[PDB]
Design a protein around this ligand. Sequence first.
Ligand SMILES: Cc1cnc(Nc2ccc(C3CCN(C)CC3)c(F)c2)nc1Nc1ccc(F)c(NS(=O)(=O)C(C)(C)C)c1
Length: 289
Amino acid sequence: QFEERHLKFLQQLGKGNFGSVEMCRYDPLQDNTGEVVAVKKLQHSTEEHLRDFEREIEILKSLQHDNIVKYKGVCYSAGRRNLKLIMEYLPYGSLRDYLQKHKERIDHIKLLQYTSQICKGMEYLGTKRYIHRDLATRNILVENENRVKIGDFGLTKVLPQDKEYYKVKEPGESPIFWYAPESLTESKFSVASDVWSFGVVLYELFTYIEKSKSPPAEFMRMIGNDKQGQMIVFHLIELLKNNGRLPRPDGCPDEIYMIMTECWNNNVNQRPSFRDLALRVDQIRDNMA
Ligand SMILES: Cc1cnc(Nc2ccc(C3CCN(C)CC3)c(F)c2)nc1Nc1ccc(F)c(NS(=O)(=O)C(C)(C)C)c1
C-alpha cells in the first residue's frame, strides 16, 4: 500500500536480529502532511530471512489489540525485492530506555499498569496460538505514559496444530538470559516459556534498568565472568537447575518477587497462566491504590 518513492528516511531507531527499524515520514502528496511511521527492513535479504519476514508480517497483520503495535502495511521495491514492514510510530521508544529516563517519576503502581498491559497483550497472542519467544523490555514500546505495546514479532512462531510447543534452534544466538531452561536444553518454546520470559521482564521493570542489575549482569556474576563462549550456556543451564535465580530487585515487594519466582518454575506445567498473572497484578494494583 506504501510506495517506496514516498518514504522519507528520518532516522534509524534500532537494529536487531537481521533487521533494522527506521523512523520515516510517509508523504505521498510531497506537501509535508504525511505521517511519521516506523519501517522495518532486513539487512541480508536472503530467501530464508525473507520468508521468515513474510511470516512475521502476516502474524502482525493478524493481531489487533490495544497493547500490540499497529501494522499499517507493506512497501516493496520494483518487483518484490526489498520488502519493508510499515507500522505505527510510537514516540517514546522502548520501555527499557523510557523506564531508565523517567525512573524517579514512575512508581510501582505505574510499573504494575505496564505489567498488566503486557500480560493482556501476551494472552491475546496465546489465544491466537502465537509464541513470542523474544519478550523483553527492549521489545516493548511506549505509546504514552499510560500505554505500552508489544512492538516486535521477529521471533514469533505459530504453534503446530497438534502440539503445545515449537522446537526451533536458530543460527546466531538469542537472549539466553531471558530463556526458559527447557528452551536452553531442548529448544522448546511454548506459552510457558513466554511466561518465564515475562517473569524476567517483570524483574527488568523493577530494576529500573539499573546498570549492575540487568539479567545478563546478574547471571554472569552468578556463574562467574571467568567462563567463555559455549560454556556460558552450559553453566547457566545448571544455575537454573539448582534453582539459582535472579535476585529480588531493590525495593520490590515480596509478592511481586513471588510472581517473578513463580514464573521461574523449572516445571513447565506449574507456571502461572497470563490470565492468572493479570488477575494477581490487577488485584495488587487495586490494593496499592
Ligand atoms: C515498531 C516501532 C514503532 N515505533 C518505534 N518508536 C521508537 C521511538 C524512539 C526510539 C528511540 C528514542 C531515542 N533513541 C535514541 C533512538 C530511538 C526508538 F528506538 C523507537 N519503534 C518501533 N520498533 C523498534 C524500533 C527500534 C528498536 F530498536 C526496536 N527494538 S527491537 O524490537 O528489539 C528490534 C531492533 C526491532 C529487534 C524496535
